[PDB]
């Protein structure tokens, strides 16, 4: 469980992210696709993008970035009490999109990378540690739903 102090460090930096959701969303997905090319193959709607310049130019990619970070934000603001928000997400990602838990670990790493680039002063080691905890909590609760459905993996 995160403490109240750690949740405050998470939400203090998230309020920054929310100043520019679309720029953040795009940086994170591009970092994910460049660092782990196998993730791009899951998106029929983005598979055609071959370079970083092409990714940067895609309005649809940017629009999906907003989708992802808006869902993540709604979870983070529930500070662990996120059952209603998380359940539909795990169901679709396990059963419809077929996303391995490992990929959620990849995109967690991408989020931390980008937060670190854009918000140094609000993202020192203590914030980084709290954000890693929040994302681990996210993954741990999703993995439990996967297991139930028969997708641990
Ligand atoms: C921070 C973690 C993630 C969040 C909050 C997230 C959230 C979402 C949301 C809200 C949607 C649209 C509604 C739905 O289908 O559930 C979605 C769709 C999708 N996500 Fe994620 N996602 C996450 C991670 C990933 C990762 C790691 C992959 C692939 C490596 C993935 C692949 C997909 C796919 C394939 C779709 C459908 C895209 C389309 O064709 O419209 N997601 N995600």
Rounded CA-CA distance 78/85 in Å is 9
Residue keyed to tokens 């790493």: 109
* Contact between residue 56 and residue 26 where contact means Cβ atoms under 8 Å apart: yes
Instruction: For the domain made up of 1-153, give the CATH fold.
Output: Globin-like (1.10.490)
Q: What is the resolution of this structure in A?
A: 1.7
CA 93–ligand 1 middle distance (angstroms): 7
Torsion of CA 100, 104, 106, 109, to 10 degrees: -170
User: Crossing angle of helices 101-118/125-149, nearest 10°?
Assistant: 160
Length in residues, the chain: 153
Q: What are the structure tokens assigned to 127, written together?
A: 């914030």
State which ligand 1 atom lies nearest to the alpha carbon of 67: 10
b vs e for 42-61, b when ≥16 Cβ sit within 10 Å of the residue's Cβ? eeeebeebeeeeebeebeeb
Q: What are the structure tokens assigned to 47, written together?
A: 């598979």
State which ligand 1 atom lies nearest to the alpha carbon of 96: 15
**DSSP state for residue 121 in the 8-state scheme:** G
* Contact between residue 26 and residue 61 where contact means Cβ atoms under 8 Å apart: yes
Structure-solving method? X-ray
Residues flanking ligand 1, CB < 6 Å: 39, 42-43, 45, 67-68, 71-72, 89, 92-93, 97, 99, 103-104, 107
């Amino acid at each position: 469980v995160l403490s109240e102090g750690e949740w405050q460090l998470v939400l203090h930096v998230w309020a920054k992210v929310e100043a520019d959701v679309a720029g953040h969303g795009q940086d994170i997905l591009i970092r994910l696709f460049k660092s782990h090319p196998e993730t791009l193959e899951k998106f029929d709607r983005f598979k055609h993008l071959k370079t970083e310049a092409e990714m940067k130019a895609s309005e649809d990619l940017k629009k999906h970035g907003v989708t992802v970070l808006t869902a993540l934000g709604a979870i983070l603001k529930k500070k662990g009490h996120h059952e209603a928000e998380l359940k539909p997400l795990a169901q679709s990602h396990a059963t419809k999109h077929k996303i391995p838990i490992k990929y959620l670990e990849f995109i967690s790493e991408a989020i931390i990378h980008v937060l670190h680039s854009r918000h140094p002063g609000d993202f020192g080691a203590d914030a980084q540690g709290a954000m890693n905890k929040a994302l681990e909590l996210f993954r741990k609760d999703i993995a439990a739903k996967y297991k139930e459905l028969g997708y641990q993996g």
